Structure formats: C-alpha cells, structure tokens
Amino acid sequence: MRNYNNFNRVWKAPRRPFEKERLDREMKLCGQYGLRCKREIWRVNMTLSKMRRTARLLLTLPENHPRRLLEGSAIMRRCHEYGFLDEEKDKLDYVLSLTVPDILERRLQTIVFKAGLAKSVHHARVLIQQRHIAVAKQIVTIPSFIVRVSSERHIAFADASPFGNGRTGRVKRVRAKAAKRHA
C-alpha cells in the first residue's frame, strides 16, 4: 500500500504449446547451452522481440528523423558493446537479423566455456554459481550475465576462490581438520 516500486515480466510462453519442430529446436538450445528450463530461451526471445520491434519502428521513419537518428545510434551502440552485432555492420537493418544464438553466445556461462575456464558448458554454470568466476575483479554468480566485449578480456578466476589466490575449499579443509583431530 502506497509502494511505487515498479516490476514487470521478462518472458512469454509460446502460442502453440506442442510443436514438434519448436520443441526439438528448444531442446537443441537447452542441451547446447546448459539451460535449466525453457524460460531462459523465452526470456531471450522476449528481448529479441523488443529489439526487433524497436528496429522496425525506427526503420519505418525517414532517415533524417531525429528520433530515428538518436535511437538507432543507441541501439547500434548497445548491440556493439554487448557483442550481439559485429562491429563491421552498422546499419539499422542488421538488428532485425539477430537470432537467439547470438545472445546465447554472450552469456557468462558460454563465454567461460569458450574461453576455457571450464571443460564444458555444464561445468561453466557450476563454476559461476559456486563463486569461482570474477569479471573485472568482481565475483559474478549469475550464469545469464551478458558479457560486454570490453569485459571479455578481464574474465578470470576469482582472487577469493581456491582456483586462485583464495584458501583451500571444503574437501581439503575438512580433510585437514580430520587430520588435526586424528593427531
């Protein structure tokens, strides 16, 4: 009551619940990127739909339109920093051609797996959720963290993690404590 904190939704379910082709493609994506459920794919779908709707509205307007200029520059910038679009292509019609894998590549789990800090995409999610990966000296625990191209270089193991400058984990800590108990 008398609270003005805003909240909205980020995903939307498909119109047809059971399509063989859609289910097969979504299972492809889930297995390829190690996703807990289809709701992550649907969230990416909603982000893509919003971006493409904005791009269509801007492309309807004439080129000299100040609104088109400002918002197209903003969307170009956002795509380029977040890595969805290659820097070579700078037209407003390349946002319309974006696909779900383009954003799914930018997730911190996929980025860690590709960079080699993890042996698999299911290993990368565990590594992130277990406070082992730090992006630019900041521990990131969210697998869906979309990585900027400038922050791609700074991804490494956390200084507080055992796979780094931190103290030994539970397996070793508990074994050492048991050895002390025996001695």
């Binding site: 299972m27 492809k28 889930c30 297995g31 390829q32 190690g34 996703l35 807990r36 459920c37 299911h122 999610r125």
Partner: protein, 58 residues
C-alpha cells in the same frame, strides 16, 4: 443403482510401485534428455523416431 460405486477401483489388484534410484532434477535432467535424444541416438533424418517403443505383444 448407487450400490456399484467404486466397483472397479476396489476390484483392481493392488501393485506397489518399484523403488528406483533418484533421477537428475535440475538442468541435469535436460542434459540427460539432450544426450539421450540428440547425441547418443544419431539416427539419420527421414526415419521416424519412437520416444517410447515397446516390446511386441499380442
């Protein structure tokens, strides 16, 4: 003729459920399904896949 209610449910011989090991629950189950359907079975396209194929009977 309300005296026959529950007839078949009461006549059904009770069979207890078998105890099986716990299945993966989170994204591990999605991984299991993906490896089973798209990785382990590499059947060529054009042939119908059966997600539940059964031994012949009757």
């Amino acid at each position: 003729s309300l005296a026959r209610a529950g007839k078949v449910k009461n006549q059904t011989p009770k069979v207890a459920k078998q105890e099986k090991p716990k299945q993966p629950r989170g994204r591990a189950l999605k991984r299991l399904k993906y490896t089973r359907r798209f990785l382990s079975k590499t059947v060529k396209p054009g042939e119908k896949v059966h997600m539940n194929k059964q031994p012949p009977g009757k």
